[PDB]
Amino acid sequence: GSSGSSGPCYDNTFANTCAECQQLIGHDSRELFYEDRHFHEGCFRCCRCQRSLADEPFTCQDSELLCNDCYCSAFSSGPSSG
Template sequence: MEHYSCTYCDTPLTGMRYVLRQDQPTCLTCFEDKFADKCYECNKPIGTDFKDLSYKGRHWHEECFKCWACQGSLANQQFVGKDDGLYCPTCYDTNFALRCDRCNNTFKHGQQKFEYSGKRYHAQCFLCAICQQSIGNNNFVPREEDTLICMPCYNDNFAKRCGKCAEVRIKLVTSVVVTTN
């Protein structure tokens, strides 16, 4: 044990802290210089006394692992990766999340989204212009720009009827695409 030393610099390791790397004793200085991951934010080595947080092959010191927008800590928090950046859920929603074309609020992850004519709507925003009920997956008729009428309201208010029996003669039906974000 009196000749137990670092494989790379020959520093004696007896009574010292060291790292066994591939069964080779390595002093902390050599480990940090040669093998420690570099922090993506500050570019300094992440030594043995620091927590190494990693995502998609990049590494950070715990104090460097921050939201790219608000600079709040992401350590022990949920976060979202976008392009090369990392964001807290609030900043991600503010900057990147899809928005409803009616209320302009964001779609949360897993929330149902209705799409029609290039526009996206929350279920509570995808409403009949007459009865204000959710159209959901039901058939509807578009009237004018951004005005949707559910089939019962269309039939009651706009549909052509048979002069003899008053039954609806023509039903116009349009469908919607429903996705989950």
């Protein structure tokens, strides 16, 4: 990490910025504004298998989103039957 964190500021950015790639939105791209935040038709893909989530059946979660092919997983795999 670093140190010497400077102070904040006040900017007037009038343009949606993907909450994933931190990039503006509007470049001939389909906006996928969600309840959480805005995202690009692409960046808005399962963070497990990178699957497109454009009006598809999935299980949205907190600060995360898993597709119907991921959400239904078995974390058990990780650890063992200690």
